[PDB]
């Protein structure tokens, strides 16, 4: 009886998050999921229930279609053996924005209701230009009870130091990390409204 982890690698973590200024394809995506247990009135990160999810994973032997880490999650949550007694809260760290509601987000909503004991917080690093539909899908998401926002500097460090282990070395993105946090913020935050049709 032992535990099972994975801890993504740096070269990959940085790369996958590096990509390029604009998007590439509505297929290559990477989301980082974690689990927190409110202990002593504070949130505590649990490594035994933490990990990252990619596009294609297990259950592929069935020849199923569509590969989104968001979906894979909804399937792995049961593995976290949650409980309706205590209070949990998972955090999603994606180097991009959701694809669509009825697609991915829509699913996250149905799940948010199924398990009200566990809350879900989303955090995107960049906005999808080739897919400006995620906006509407988002509004529907926050409505599910979850909360979304833009990744900050200190935030990235938490994920980099948490998910990627490297002699406890500091995080190193590029240079426009902050400059982006402000710019993107204005955009995302502004999109968190989208009214007047």
Which whole-number Å values give the CA distances from 74 to 19, 63, 78, in the listed order? 26, 19, 8
27: Cβ–Cβ under 8 A, 6 or more apart, which residues? 55, 67
Q: Which of 104, 124, 137, 148 binds Zn ion (CB under 5 A)?
A: 104
Which is nearer to Zn ion, 105 or 164 (by Cβ)?
A: 105
**53 contributes a contact to Zn ion by CB under 5 A:** no
135 with 189: CB under 8 angstroms? no
Which is nearer to Zn ion, 99 or 151 (by Cβ)?
A: 99
Residue 70 a catalytic site member: yes
Q: Which stretch binds Zn ion (CB under 5 A): 35-43, 92-100, 128-136, 185-193?
A: 92-100
Site string for Zn ion, 134-173 (x = CB under 5 A): ----------------------------------------
Residue 85, classified by CB atoms within 10 Å of its CB into exposed (0-12), middle (13-18) or buried (19+), is exposed
Is 68 annotated in a binding site? The answer is yes
92 with 123: CB under 8 angstroms? yes
Both structure tokens of 188: 């995302």
Active site residues: 70
Q: Which residues contact Zn ion (rule: CB under 5 A)?
A: 68, 99, 103-104
């Amino acid at each position: 009886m032992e535990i099972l982890r994975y801890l993504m690698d740096p070269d990959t973590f940085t790369f996958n998050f590096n990509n390029d200024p604009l998007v590439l394809r509505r297929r290559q995506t990477y989301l980082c999921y974690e689990v927190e247990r409110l202990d002593n009135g504070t949130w505590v990160l649990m490594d035994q229930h933490m990990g990252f999810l990619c596009n294609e994973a297990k259950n592929l032997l069935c020849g199923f279609y569509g590969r989104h880490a968001e979906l894979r999650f909804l399937d792995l949550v049961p593995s976290l053996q949650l409980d309706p007694a205590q209070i949990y809260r998972v955090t999603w760290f994606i180097s991009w924005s959701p694809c669509f509601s009825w697609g991915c987000a829509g699913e996250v909503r149905a799940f948010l209701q199924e398990n009200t004991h566990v809350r879900l917080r989303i955090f995107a690093a960049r906005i999808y230009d080739y897919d400006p539909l995620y906006k509407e899908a988002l509004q529907m998401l926050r409505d599910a009870g979850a909360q979304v926002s833009i990744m900050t500097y200190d935030e990235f460090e938490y994920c980099w130091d948490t998910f990627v282990y490297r002699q406890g070395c500091p995080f190193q993105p590029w240079d426009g990390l902050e400059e982006h946090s402000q710019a993107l913020s204005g955009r995302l935050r502004a999109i968190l409204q989208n009214q007047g049709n």
